[PDB]
Amino acid sequence: ALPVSDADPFALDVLQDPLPFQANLRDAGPVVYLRRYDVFALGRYEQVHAALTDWQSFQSAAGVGLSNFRYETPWRPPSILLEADPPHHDAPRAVLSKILGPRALQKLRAAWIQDAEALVDQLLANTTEFDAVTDLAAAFPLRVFPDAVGIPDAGRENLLPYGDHAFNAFGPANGLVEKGAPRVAELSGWVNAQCARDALTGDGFGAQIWAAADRGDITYEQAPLVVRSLLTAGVDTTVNGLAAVLYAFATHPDQWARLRENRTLARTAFDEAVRWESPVQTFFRTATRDTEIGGATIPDGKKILMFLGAANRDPRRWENPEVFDLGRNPSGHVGYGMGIHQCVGQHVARLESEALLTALASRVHSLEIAGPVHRHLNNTLRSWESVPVKVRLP
Ligand code: HEM
Ligand SMILES: CCc1ccc(C(=O)O)cc1
């Protein structure tokens, strides 16, 4: 009965430009069987939302990549947040929810704002033409987030590769994964080292996680894996979200002026970029029982592929979805997911954006694309390689 398709969402040509595919997915029906992978794809907002929230029907503990941990060996000990269901999910989630929550981040705001202003000021002192990825979007998270976690300086060059491999590894064992598999032992080796109590400053998120373990909120065994979650999820996502927002502003002069005309728009600017780009494209779930969704039965034990990018551009939910518009209300986009696993780092992402955008807006009159943009292909993370920009100063 279902629409059925030979489309490969992880083919390089789709990864380079996934918008065609998303439209085809959404157009085919609520539920498309991807024969290539024996999973059920969902591309419309309504079903993606329903699948995300229904953790009882659609579990995470069997893996939220293609790989089914029922049968297949994980490349790493699975995340005790992302790949855990209730009740195991609950305690580590609650720890991060508190540590990364708005109240907690309040104390970092002025420092991050300040660090962003310094970054931008020093960049613009040297040059008004530069790569928005390497000089801003990549630079700024690396300058603030590792320090805030409180890991040592040694080995920080592993953060982006580690993150990229983890997101690739949610995909099939295709070239993007298999070309990374030599390096994982040394990648996994480093990150585990950063997660130990003795490797971490006694100030940052890491120390706070360990302090939560002292109170018994989590165990000393969970504590380093909780730190690990931050070091997997917390860097590459924000780099690519920041690249997207910068790309959006550089191609939308009116939206840029609107930001400049009201600095409180940063928050909603970043959230709209998250909707519009959807840096995290896809996640899987595993059906725990035969389940009806969008008219289709998902057999017990089979995986659903949720297309967050496609749901975020679904015209059933969004007016003129292709447009980047800070006048839009993007609240309810599924770019951070939805329900019990909804991104716990969203306050962290929004603050980085607020800091960087405020700093940029203070010093840049207008912003243009200065040269060809280039994507970095990844199975699950829409990644920006280069975004040459030129700025005009006041
Ligand atoms: C633009 C930035 C970000 C995007 C687009 C993003 C996206 C996501 C999405 C889609 C999920 C849901 C996973 C699922 O449903 O299976 C998620 C979960 C998560 N994110 Fe984020 N994220 C971002 C930034 C961050 C940051 C800065 C951190 C940490 C500081 C972080 C940590 C996490 C964690 C630990 C989870 C798992 C939570 C759970 O399973 O309960 N993310 N993120
Ligand atoms: C942002 C998607 C994501 C969420 C959590 C993890 C992790 O816990 O390692 C890794 C990736």
What span, in angstroms and rounded, lies between the C-alpha atoms of 323 and 200?
Answer: 42
Tell me how far apart the 2 most distant CA atoms of the chain are, in Å.
62
What span, in angstroms and rounded, lies between the C-alpha atoms of 392 and 366?
Answer: 5
**What is the token pair recorded at 296?**
């289709």
Give me the domain span that covers residue 51.
4-392
Tell me phi and psi for residue 127, to 5 degrees: -160, 150
Beta partners for 39?
34, 303
CATH of the domain at 38: 1.10.630.10
DSSP structure class, residue 316: T
Q: How far is CA 133 from the centre of its chain?
A: 16
Question: Which among 385, 382, 384, 387 has a CA at the least distance from the CA of 168?
Answer: 382
Q: Is 292 exposed, middle or buried (0-12, 13-18, 19+ CB in 10 A)?
A: exposed
DSSP structure class, residue 381: B
Cβ–Cβ < 8 Å for 359, 119:
yes
Name every protein residue with a CB atom under 6 angstroms from any ligand 1 atom: 60, 64, 81-82, 93, 96, 100, 229-230, 233-234, 237-238, 241, 274, 279-280, 283, 335-337, 341, 343-345, 348-349
User: How many angstroms separate the Cα of 195 from the Cα of each of 30, 201, 292?
Assistant: 42, 11, 41
What span, in angstroms and rounded, lies between the C-alpha atoms of 25 and 120?
Answer: 41
- Exposure b/e, 347-372, CB count within 10 A at least 16 = b: bbbbbbbbbbbbbbbeebeebeebee
Substitution candidate for ligand 2 out of 52, 64, 80, 81 with most atoms within 8 A of CB: 81
What span, in angstroms and rounded, lies between the C-alpha atoms of 18 and 12?
Answer: 10
Q: What is the DSSP string of 324-369?
A: --TTS--TT-SBTB-STTS-TTHHHHHHHHHHHHHHHHHH-SEEEE
Question: Which among 249, 277, 254, 251 has a CA at the least distance from the CA of 358?
Answer: 249
Into how many domains does the chain fold?
1
DSSP structure class, residue 79: P
What span, in angstroms and rounded, lies between the C-alpha atoms of 21 and 310?
Answer: 9
Q: Obtained via which technique? A: X-ray
